[PDB]
Amino acid sequence: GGYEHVTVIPNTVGVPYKTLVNRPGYSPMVLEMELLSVTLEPTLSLDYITCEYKTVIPSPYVKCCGTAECKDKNLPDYSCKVFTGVYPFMWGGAYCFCDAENTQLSEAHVEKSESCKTEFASAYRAHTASASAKLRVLYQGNNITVTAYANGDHAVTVKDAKFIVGPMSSAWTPFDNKIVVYKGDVYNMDYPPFGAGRPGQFGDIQSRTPESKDVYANTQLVLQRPAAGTVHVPYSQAPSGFKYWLKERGASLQHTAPFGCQIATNPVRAVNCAVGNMPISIDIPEAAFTRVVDAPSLTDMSCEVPACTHSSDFGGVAIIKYAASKKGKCAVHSMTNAVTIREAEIEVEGNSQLQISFSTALASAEFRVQVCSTQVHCAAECHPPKDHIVNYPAS
Amino acid sequence: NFNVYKATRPYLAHCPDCGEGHSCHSPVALERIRNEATDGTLKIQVSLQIGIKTDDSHDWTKLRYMDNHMPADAERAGLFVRTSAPCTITGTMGHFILARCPKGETLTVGFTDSRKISHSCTHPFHHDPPVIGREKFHSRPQHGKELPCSTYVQSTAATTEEIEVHMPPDTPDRTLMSQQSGNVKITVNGQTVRYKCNCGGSNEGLTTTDKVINNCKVDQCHAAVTNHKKWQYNSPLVPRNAELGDRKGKIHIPFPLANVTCRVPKARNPTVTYGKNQVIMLLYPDHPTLLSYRNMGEEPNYQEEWVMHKKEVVLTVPTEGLEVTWGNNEPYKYWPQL
Amino acid sequence: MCLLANTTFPCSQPPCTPCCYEKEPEETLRMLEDNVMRPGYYQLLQASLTCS
Numbered sequence A: 001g002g003y004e005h006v007t008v009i010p011n012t013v014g015v016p017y018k019t020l021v022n023r024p025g026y027s028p029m030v031l032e033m034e035l036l037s038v039t040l041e042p043t044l045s046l047d048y049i050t051c052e053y054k055t056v057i058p059s060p061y062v063k064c065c066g067t068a069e070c071k072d073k074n075l076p077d078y079s080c081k082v083f084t085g086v087y088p089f090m091w092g093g094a095y096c097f098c099d100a101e102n103t104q105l106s107e108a109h110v111e112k113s114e115s116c117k118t119e120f121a122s123a124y125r126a127h128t129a130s131a132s133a134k135l136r137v138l139y140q141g142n143n144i145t146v147t148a149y150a151n152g153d154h155a156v157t158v159k160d161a162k163f164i165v166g167p168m169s170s171a172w173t174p175f176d177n178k179i180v181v182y183k184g185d186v187y188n189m190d191y192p193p194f195g196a197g198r199p200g201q202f203g204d205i206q207s208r209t210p211e212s213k214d215v216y217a218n219t220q221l222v223l224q225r226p227a228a229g230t231v232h233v234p235y236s237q238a239p240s241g242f243k244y245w246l247k248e249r250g251a252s253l254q255h256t257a258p259f260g261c262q263i264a265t266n267p268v269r270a271v272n273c274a275v276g277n278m279p280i281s282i283d284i285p286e287a288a289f290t291r292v293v294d295a296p297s298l299t300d301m302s303c304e305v306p307a308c309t310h311s312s313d314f315g316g317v318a319i320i321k322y323a324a325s326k327k328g329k330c331a332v333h334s335m336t337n338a339v340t341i342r343e344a345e346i347e348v349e350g351n352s353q354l355q356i357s358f359s360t361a362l363a364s365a366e367f368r369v370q371v372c373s374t375q376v377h378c379a380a381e382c383h384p385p386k387d388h389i390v391n392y393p394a395s
Numbered sequence B: 001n002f003n004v005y006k007a008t009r010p011y012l013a014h015c016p017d018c019g020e021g022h023s024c025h026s027p028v029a030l031e032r033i034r035n036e037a038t039d040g041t042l043k044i045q046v047s048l049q050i051g052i053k054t055d056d057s058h059d060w061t062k063l064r065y066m067d068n069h070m071p072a073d074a075e076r077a078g079l080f081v082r083t084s085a086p087c088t089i090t091g092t093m094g095h096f097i098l099a100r101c102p103k104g105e106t107l108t109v110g111f112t113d114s115r116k117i118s119h120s121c122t123h124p125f126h127h128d129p130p131v132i133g134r135e136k137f138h139s140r141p142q143h144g145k146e147l148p149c150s151t152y153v154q155s156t157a158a159t160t161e162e163i164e165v166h167m168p169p170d171t172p173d174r175t176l177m178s179q180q181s182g183n184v185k186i187t188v189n190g191q192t193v194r195y196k197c198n199c200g201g202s203n204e205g206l207t208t209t210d211k212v213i214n215n216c217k218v219d220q221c222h223a224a225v226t227n228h229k230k231w232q233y234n235s236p237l238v239p240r241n242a243e244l245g246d247r248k249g250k251i252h253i254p255f256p257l258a259n260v261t262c263r264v265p266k267a268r269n270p271t272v273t274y275g276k277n278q279v280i281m282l283l284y285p286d287h288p289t290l291l292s293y294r295n296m297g298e299e300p301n302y303q304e305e306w307v308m309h310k311k312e313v314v315l316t317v318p319t320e321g322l323e324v325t326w327g328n329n330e331p332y333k334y335w336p337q338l
Numbered sequence C: 001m002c003l004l005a006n007t008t009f010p011c012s013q014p015p016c017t018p019c020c021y022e023k024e025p026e027e028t029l030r031m032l033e034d035n036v037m038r039p040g041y042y043q044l045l046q047a048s049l050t051c052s
């Protein structure tokens, strides 16, 4: 119970496109379509999270006049060492009665820092991407918003008009198979698998969730012999891998991605990637259409261009004089692909005139304007603009 | 009422630099310096307790430190934190200090006691906090771009974060021993003293009363007082209690780390001039500003440079388009005219 | 539930109340040390170190 209009627009956000709906035996219809946003959300699989590690060192066991013994503890990066011939000094002299027969048991292990819930990087496995689009349509003199998945199998009905967006011509994504996420920044990184991190590098400590309980650690923790008459636990360890990636990470994908991709998080997605085209299907109901006989008839048409500038914007002005049979709404459309008209619909009266705004790149613009069902020839001499570089895209 | 400080106490611990590069048993010893906060805030752990008096009462103008066997009161105003230059202290509670420090290679925390003797502890610590955003600014603005950052909250509240605590070890003290004509006299002074002598008869035990060791020299004996009444942080700079196994306790700590918002300023828009397939920008930065650019096509060719002073930049604008980011400002987009 | 040698008691209600630490500081800390692994440790810590 209606007419299906199928058209294809380039995948470019912020550019209004004009489409002519021509149902046989019915008056032409002009629809303005503009992509507000195009979102590419990939499916994520969290491998692990990384953060700053914590070296837990308790009070050393100083055995005076005896030998301490190291116990094998099931802890990440657990290190134990008994040092012989120690003579530690405290505030009121020597801590031990014996001169040489004293031992110090030094113990240490690696665990997640308190910061891990606040400061962390996540390692994700990115695969197939779900495309979605937000489209603005100038339908019946009003702006309607349509939000649909760009797969070609998701019908969204707004004001009785059924919309089918996609499928996308390009399956391109700025994300690789392996990605790293830190706050509002996403990085394409071939991160080390889980259980294989290196010391002082990204993944020196790997846990599955910021609150998991077991954790993997490879920090090269080695305990050293304490200083003469000093109670302390000296050690050699590779510095935080997270804290160093955070310094040498470089520019995120928001800055490095091709096609002018905007990168957002929570969830991670590619916004406004200017790649390929987008097919659009609109099932316009029968009630919206009006017959050619029922629509006003146009005769004795003439076109004059008092002002024109060939630029990206509507730098052209055209005055079209007409003779109409009756009062009603008439659709305005350019029959020449090199010229685009700003207005989609105008109110016709009788022996009056209409004013339209047009955009062209040609210095000598020869174009036909279809007002309702009659065409009028426009002759335009357009001049160059003051600026060579523009801040907004055009058709 | 709840006061965790009734059980805990300030202590003396090893410090590698107490002044002029000499090691000492410091009452202001540094335990751990935390720098997880992206805003630059440092969470410093010290051996003394700030905001608590010797009688356990909470007083923000007071400080509690270990004064040779017994804790003593000191002024909060006398407490100082410094790296290469003095730091700005943002919060103090117990063993913890919150401070905003300039670029440095060492970290010093000190105070002034009763008899005006300044005690300080210097530890080697590389401090150079990373830049938040794309502009290296000095002073924080009221209004600007909202970017995610972390800090240690000023709240006193005891939740989330924690530290391990245990009973302190036997404190050696040679003043407990004296010579009674030519023998060894151990004066208990209403304390529990553990003693060991290199002589016959009696040389062991934990005593609550005065003991005498006949035909023994003062150098041949060792005496230590036992403190089984209070709690102390599980410090690697203090020895473990020998007459106790793996017995430990835990207490909640102030100022935990949490995500907040950092206000960043936007560099002034440069004077823009256009040409044939190219853009010219006259940059006037007040501070180091990151300038980045990319093509909006198949080959983005990302390039970046930190602009320090007055510089003119000539960039080629391709048919696909050019995106330019000048500091914390929103990216500028350029396209050539048909 | 919290532990005290061989009795078993509610964490928020230790038998030493009121002034657990003031009456006997040694046995209060020993009791707290025996309940570190228990989930209701902080309920016991709050009650033991509270007095007016």
Ligand SMILES: *[C@@H]1O[C@H](CO)[C@@H](O[C@H]2O[C@H](CO)[C@@H](O)[C@H](O)[C@H]2NC(C)=O)[C@H](O)[C@H]1NC(C)=O
Pocket (backbone or CB within 6 Å): A016, A138, A141, A142, A143
């Ligand atoms: C439909 O939406 C468009 C875009 O928001 C509106 O177009 C114009 O809106 C203003 C004039 O009313 C101008 O300030 C804008 O420059 C202009 N924008 C574009 C892209 O042409 C239009 O008025 C809307 N029509 C409705 C709501 O009936």
Ligand SMILES: *[C@@H]1O[C@H](CO)[C@@H](O)[C@H](O)[C@H]1NC(C)=O
Pocket (backbone or CB within 6 Å): A117, A118, A119, A183, B148, B257, B258, B259
């Ligand atoms: C901090 O980290 C992230 C925001 O970056 C958020 O998911 C989390 O809940 C925050 N947690 C805390 C404890 O601040």
